[model samples]
Target: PVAETISKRFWTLIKMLRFYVVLRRFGYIDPLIYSIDPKQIKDVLSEALREFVSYTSSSSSRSIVIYDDPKNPVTAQAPCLVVAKRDEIPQNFPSIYRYTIYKIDKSSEYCISPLVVNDKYATLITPNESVIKEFFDKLDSNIQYARVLASLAVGGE
Candidate 1:
């Protein structure tokens, strides 16, 4: 049921935090010199998206120079730097979908996406709610797995 699908704990977390978390897409220690007031906004970075991301991959989607982090140390996945893009209306999108419907006294759909990053390969870490819920409004709660749910989030560029 739609009424109960959203657990009380989840609601509590959202309420406690007030503003949903939107994790930082790019890693720290970049040559670009990223800036953010941590006191004003919550930001996080996994080990993968570090500053000293040396070397390069041939995937074409991921190719950049990264470096290590000073505040948080995490192990990243892939060739140090990997550029990926997942849009809702992807012309060359993969053939896979997760359908969701609720019985809220009737048949209804929900734009529910999990609170996590890397929805496609499950290799990404969940950022702030903003990063997570970016594409949620346009999705169906019945989704079992979809990268677009987290990919369409802001600050990926």
Candidate 2:
């Protein structure tokens, strides 16, 4: 079970740390390190919107920007999660790869231009498609699991 605990804390720590890095890099830490803790983790996660693009740190789809303009330079390029995984991890945007959550989302929506990418977040709740009632539960819990899996690709995790 030591492995499990390490993994649990690993996921929890990385998410909180990434947020801190973002906030700090953006000047939110002027007061100090600001004393991050588990209680604070829930607050940031509360704002979690079932978005796959936010996982940009792991993948290569500008589905959000592309949905706006295919030719737009920002379509294949936007400054997001990409910043977190430059040469340190695999290019993981789902739309670029087949059989991924973002691919499924794009297929399901029939979106001519994909928006957002990767279902790293989606896998937690919808592990199976037939469970209509567990949808919400799965979605809510899956974000953290996504955070855990995503952490695997993150070097420091």
Candidate 3:
């Protein structure tokens, strides 16, 4: 069962990577990657949330969105995606071993800095509007689509 669980988690990680690639194609900037154990996901996410809350001014009227499994929600050992305003976010959100936080506001002040937490690492990407196209073009040339697909194929076994 332990091996099965590891494989399952790995598959999920690959799916998340694919999702990130899609985001990159859509003009998101390169992420700020961090290496951490899975146990620290909650702590990191909390800090990310705090950073977002502190960075945005009160006058901004942008909403953030969070994505999680409706049936399972989030827990210390689970994963979810959050993209919401500070006021809209809960003080005690479901914890997760892996998760992503995105700032989806259109305003100039709140559009930068999205977060992603994978099994053994985390990333915070800041999108600069002025050079998004240039960044995206660069990222497109460096994507490892084949590597991801190969991982997915192996995980399926």
Candidate 4:
């Protein structure tokens, strides 16, 4: 079960990364600049990034850009320049229905901003709503898979 869980998550992450590259290639997303330093924040692009980072957490939720070779699965999934959002809400803490329960890669790639003028922190423009929904759908499916693995781990069935 442990192995299965790890394996499944790994593959799911790869799928998400691949999805990011494909959309980027098609110009579905634009690059945006973001930063951790408060004053560095500027423009609608930076404001969006600040919001996402602040809403979530400075570390995991911090908005930043990453770049890598999309052709290689290993490289593609190595935390490169893909705009994504994931929130790990405690199950019993703030459980909100309207909020997303699962984190997805390429979830926010197209926000409203993209390309060139490189900076340290990576970011992106908002992705299409349909794409975001589709990504969440797939992510939710895998979340279910992960849950099943968790159940089986305890010898539930």
Candidate 5:
């Protein structure tokens, strides 16, 4: 039973690390510190948006930006959840790293894009019409599990 438990814990750590790596790549937080507290990262992200971006979040898909330059003006981007068929993700806004949700398919399945480039606050190239319902539930809940797994990664308290 001890061996089985150890194996289970190992897998949980692996999963949390996977999520951390993704979030870190996007400059969401202090890149180097992939700690157990996702909320810390979330807080910093929110602060930066309101600080540098002068951002206003009307909703997940709708944000208004006030930049330092007048030419830049107020713009928006979806920073949304997207699921594209393998062939559908064309050249312009390509997948963050050609990664997909869970490998339901190579050409067709659910997927979410990395955060909206540097323009975290903008109306996306186009507004996301909707989200993959199941993805929302899973992704939302997964972070809580991520914290649990992170606890194990940090040497179970």
Candidate 6:
């Protein structure tokens, strides 16, 4: 029984680390560090959203961002961020809804009611207008840069 318990704890650590890697990639290192308390780690690993938010909360920011599946986006199928205020998140919901909440600090102005939709489908809720504008503007520029790079390569050929 001791051996089994040890293995179980080991696997739990592995899962937490895996999620950590994903959060790091999303540029949330600062908040992640703040949220990495021993007690909070246990709560985070158990998939408790409220505790996750509580630990990650910052005095300067009221909005929290959560992704559909931070560990495996492909498995999530419709990977996207769910931006909402700390108080807006539900205490319980259907099991079908899966979210990986992050601790990144965001302004209260950017906060909105929770809504979930695929990238290609209709868009509403989360991140508000300012956030969406910033996202699309950056996205547009990146696409433009990629096209310019392609054109240059073709011309050289």
Estimate the TM-score of every prediction.
0.16, 0.24, 0.20, 0.18, 0.22, 0.18
Q: Quick one: RMSD of model 6?
A: 20.3
Per residue, candidate 1 scores C-alpha lDDT tens digits across 1-157 of 3223333213322211211112132332221123333211123222322221221222222211122245543322222122323332222211221111001111121111211224222121223455335323322333321222122221121
Output the better candidate (3/5) by lDDT: 5
Candidate 3 TM-score, true structure as reference: 0.20
> In model 3, which regions exceed 4 Å deviation?
1-36, 56-157
Q: What TM-score, to 2 decimals, does candidate 6 have? A: 0.18
lDDT of each: 0.23, 0.30, 0.32, 0.29, 0.34, 0.31
**Shift of residue 107 alpha carbon in model 1, Å:** 2.6
| Residue-level lDDT tens digits of model 4 in 65-148 | 233235632111112232333332223311221111112234533211122113333333233445434434443444443333
Model 6 Cα lDDT, one tens digit per residue, 1-157 = 3234323333222222223332332122222234424333334333433323433353133333433346633212222233445455433321212323333322432222122335323222222345324423432434332222222212210
User: Against the true structure, whose lDDT is highest?
Assistant: 5
Off by over 4 Å in 1: 1-36, 43-106, 115-152, 155-157
lDDT-better candidate, 4 vs 6:
6
Q: State, as a TM-score between 0 and 1, how close model 4 is to the true structure.
A: 0.18
Error of 1 at 42 (Å): 2.9
Cα error, residue 145 of model 6, in Å, equals 45
Global lDDT of model 2: 0.30
Best by TM-score: 2
How far residue 111's Cα lies from its native spot in candidate 2, in Å, is 7.6
Q: Pairs clashing in candidate 6?
A: none
